[PDB]
Design a protein around this ligand. Structure first.
Ligand SMILES: [Fe+3]
Ligand SMILES: [Fe+3]
Lengths: 170, 173
């Protein structure tokens, strides 16, 4: 009956795909998205009941520190498998900001704040397309899509360990 | 390109089904869930981009004013079809609170706040199971599942009209 049921967890919000998604990113068994990675993102994938989503995969892509995406290959792109308890871990660089205005647009141009793009998959089913953001980062105040509910949590004084739990609709 | 892309709308949260759902509720072309209904709920069904979901169906069930569900038939249950602009409306009663304790529990029993259960469907695809709540209602403060982001907005309060916009996750192409 009603009495036994826990409160559901709020769903992680969606976000725009943007123009830089590329299918075919390799599975990254060690979670390393690029050479020289020093920043770790970790967390869990849960459903709305708080149950772990075993074997979920994060399909991740981002810009490099200069704000450039790899359009030719899979640097800073990868598929990261969550474990049997829904835990994931991947290693990357802090993504840089980048201009999304046309070059001749008047000043000031619009710059995106740092962000990581994530699709969550369960086998062939896409459960979520979203973006993760960072706290107190340049252009967070003006970016159209920045959302405080999708800011990763700082797990250490160093700024190299970040955590975020996904809540997906099964 | 990024520039013109819209900001997504937050998804309507899920909620528990509870024990009183019944599949197969009939379509209600007039949106009337019970004889004598006095309260109107209306709104739109949107996707995460804010685009309307034409023809989505709300599969609604609730308790009557005494806090009792219909366990024999389909009173205060029904399927309500959104139109081509995603707009829905249905007519019901203000649901009552009801005890979720057994009498074995001591006299401080627990009651739910008033709520309406809703499943959103597109054809045979279920998009959402959730619950809608009311403002400043009894037991909102203690109910385990009450969520202010799913409280209906008073449209009139004189016509007893309430509004809520659903935001459901769809495949974007
Ligand atoms: Fe981007
Ligand atoms: Fe109920």
């Amino acid at each position: 009956g009603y009495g036994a049921q826990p409160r559901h967890l709020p769903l992680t919000g969606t976000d725009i795909l943007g123009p830089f998604y590329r299918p075919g990113a390799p599975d990254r068994p060690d979670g390393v998205l690029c050479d020289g990675a020093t920043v770790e993102l970790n967390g869990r994938v849960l459903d709305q009941e708080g149950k772990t989503v075993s074997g979920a995969v994060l399909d991740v892509w981002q810009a490099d520190a200069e704000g450039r995406y790899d359009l030719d290959g899979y640097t800073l792109r990868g598929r990261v498998a969550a474990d049997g308890q829904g835990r994931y871990r991947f290693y990357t660089v802090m993504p840089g900001c980048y201009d999304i205005s046309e070059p001749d647009d008047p000043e000031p141009h619009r710059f995106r704040c740092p962000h990581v793009h994530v699709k969550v998959w369960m086998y062939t089913q896409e459960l979520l397309t979203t973006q993760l953001y960072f706290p107190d980062a340049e252009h967070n105040d003006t970016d159209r899509w920045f959302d405080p509910s999708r800011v990763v949590s700082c797990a250490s004084r160093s700024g190299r360990k970040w955590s975020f739990d996904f809540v997906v609709q099964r």
